[model samples]
Target: MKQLTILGSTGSIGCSTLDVVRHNPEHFRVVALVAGKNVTRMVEQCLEFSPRYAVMDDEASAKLLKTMLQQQGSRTEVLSGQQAACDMAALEDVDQVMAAIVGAAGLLPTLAAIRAGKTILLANKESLVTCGRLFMDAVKQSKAQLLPVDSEHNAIFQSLPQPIQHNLGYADLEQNGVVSILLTGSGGPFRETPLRDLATMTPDQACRKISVDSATMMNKGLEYIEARWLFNASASQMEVLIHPQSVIHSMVRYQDGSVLAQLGEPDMRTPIAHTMAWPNRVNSGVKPLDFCKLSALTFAAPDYDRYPCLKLAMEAFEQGQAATTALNAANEITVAAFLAQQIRFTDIAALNLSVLEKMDMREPQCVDDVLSVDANAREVARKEVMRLA
Candidate 1:
């Protein structure tokens, strides 16, 4: 059985991972699980998986979970705090690790897992966007099997296996094997909403609009930077195009002009399953895509003016390491506040832009430098919220 340590167990990726484990109990075992303040959910997961270690982001929540687990006559270790999360991730007992926690907060623990030479399944897009070089450097230094878990990266990973897997240190995948990375976008719900009307959009509007943004190509922007780091490809070799059906996750073009793509049902399970059983295949419990059911796959060039966040992400990706972290950090705060009814939907892009302008872009030296940049970006993003209010 493949032993796994899952971080962010309460999240979408974590939940999906658990589902995968549940489906294939004979093949996999959950060794450790971690989450942020959701004590109740953590306790429930503990009951089901009976993992060796369970960690919470907050101390109080961790204590509550410990009591809850003990009440059930379970002796699973319930730990607390950021360092504990990192410790759980780097634990020597597990064969593989899933870095699914959201945003920059996931960076340290995920990095620790990589440094420990674990087969790291990465779902956190921010770690790559925020600390591209540092994260990749650690993966190399530790000889970790860094598998990309995002649908796009996984698609590219599936398509270009020979490139990503061969020649651990000698050959460069980006330069020799790759031609260009084409990010397929399904523009989010706001595709048809006019830019001029964005001033009137509310939190509810932003929530409703995110899918459109994904459909319209905004999410593709974030994926572009993520691909840059995951594939070690340059901006010139990356392009984003609108693929409205969302069936084709992404495409990787080879230098010889043979383009390959990973196509699947729009569920997250496919990529998760693929990563879980790499060098082998397993049923992810998701239905196979019905090519006949798809009326016709449509494709178009992305419209930059309609979704400025997508444009900004591309620009940030092109600027190199530190800029991407700043851009992602600002967007996270703005997007969260916007979803919380504290900021306008358009403010998502506006606030990120304003903060991006004020950031110090000195060459990022390491992960510590990336962390400092992220810290300053969040402070600036919060200031914009105050300034707008």
Candidate 2:
């Protein structure tokens, strides 16, 4: 059985990961589970999985969890604070880490997994977006296995030839007869929403902050930067297109005029299962799609005016890590502001752009350097939000 450490056990992806493990208990074991402050969900996971360790983002949550686990007669140890999360991630017994924690906060623990030479199932965008070179470089030096966990990146990983798969982030696309990496998106719920209506669209309409990222296609843009690092692709070798159905997660075009794509129902389990049993196959309990019942897939170019954040992200990647890290940091602050109704929805991109334009910081050379840039960029973004308010 493969021992696993789940870095964000209370999240949607982490829960889905547990679901996959639930179906194939004979093949996998949960060694550790980590999360922010979701004590209730963390307690349930600890009781069910009986992992060696459970980590909370702060001390109070950990204390509460420890008491609850004791009352429930669970022997699992509970830990708290950021350092505890990192220690759990780098534990000697873990063979793989499901790096599902979101944003820049995930960077250090995910790096701990890499430095320990553990196979990392990457679900966090900021780890690569905010610290692409630093993170990938550590993976290389440690000879750690880096696997994509996002549906798009996982789909791309699935469609690649085995030789290229083994040498991710360092492979040559051109030498391997590859053409371009085609990244696709569903264009979110606001695909048809008018530009003028965007500013007034509340958090209620978009569902949540993630929905807002999808609505603006900023998520895709971050993925674009992410793909660049994972596949070692240049701007000329990457392409993004709208796929309304999202049936095709991502595709890779070959020089021989053959294009390969991975298709499945829009379920996280399929990709999660694929990564879990990679170089092998396992049933994730995801049902086979009835192609006959699906609508015809359609494609289009993303309108920059409609997705200003996406456009800015594309530009940011070219500028270097400083730009992408700052953009990701600024985006989190602005998105929070938007959700709190402190700023208009469209101002997310505007504030992000404002942060990037005003900042001239040097490229980060280490994780601490990256966090400094992140903190400074967020301060700048908060000021911009107040200026707008």
Candidate 3:
């Protein structure tokens, strides 16, 4: 049985990973879990999975979690802080580490797992987007098997043939039967929302509009860089397309003019399960695709004006290093502030871009540099939020 250590177990990916564990008990074991601030939910997960260790980002929360779990006679060891989380991620017993912790906070632990040569199931896009080359270099040095847990990248991983040729070739071609990989997005809630009204959107409205800000195409922008390192492709080789139906998860075009697409529902579980048993397919609880229901799959060009985060992310992608790190950091702060009602909903991109331009782009050329840039950007964003308020 494959033993898994899941980071961010209280979040969506964590919950989904546990659900997969719940049904496939014989195939996988939950060895440890890490979470942030959700002590109650963490306790519930600890009871269900019975991991050897659990983590909380804050000390007080960790104490509460430990107390709650111990009350029920659970002997799980509890830890607190970033170092604890990183240690758990690289735990000797964990063969595979699910790096699902969201945002830049996930970087340290996820990178530690890669450095430890663990099979890293990557769900945190920021870890790559914020640190790019440095993160990839760590994987190369450690020979870590980095599998993307994101649906889009997971789709690309599935579409490739064995030997996994780096060259993008056409179907049945002499090369790897793969060319450019296309990520399809089911344009989020704002797919139909008029641009003039974006300023008036509320947190609830924004949440309802986009299942994830990713559907807004910012998700694809990060995915583009991830595709670059994961598949050994240049910016030009990676492509993004808007497929609203989401039935075609991603497509690989070959030199022979044939395109292979991986089809599935808009479920994260399918991809998560794919990474869990890679090279060995297992039932992931997702129903088989129905051709009739997917009869009207439509594709379109993404509107950069409608979703400015997409444009900003692409701009960050072009600028490189401190620019992207600052952008990611600022974006996180802006989104959090907006969610906290400290800023207007429409100000996320503007505030992030503003912070990005103020930072010295020359600073972040290494892992430590990226962390410094991220920290500085957060401090700057906090100032910006206060300035705006």
lDDT of each: 0.80, 0.90, 0.79
After superposition, the stretches of candidate 1 with alpha carbons farther than 4 Å from their true spots are 166-171, 174-177, 192-218, 336-347, 385-389
The TM-scores of all predictions, comma-separated, are: 0.90, 0.94, 0.86
Deviation from native of the Cα of residue 13 in model 1, angstroms: 1.6
Question: Ranking by lDDT, best first?
Answer: 2, 1, 3
Backbone clashes counted, model 1 = 16
Clashing pairs in 2: none
lDDT of 2: 0.90
Root-mean-square deviation of every model? 2.7, 1.9, 3.7
Candidate 3 residue runs with Cα over 4 Å from true position: 165-177, 192-216, 335-351, 363-367, 379-389
Model 2: per-residue Cα lDDT over 61-171, one tens digit each: 999999999999999999888898899889999988999998767888999999999999998866889889988899889988899989999999998888888888888
Per-residue error at 249 for model 3, in Å? 1.6
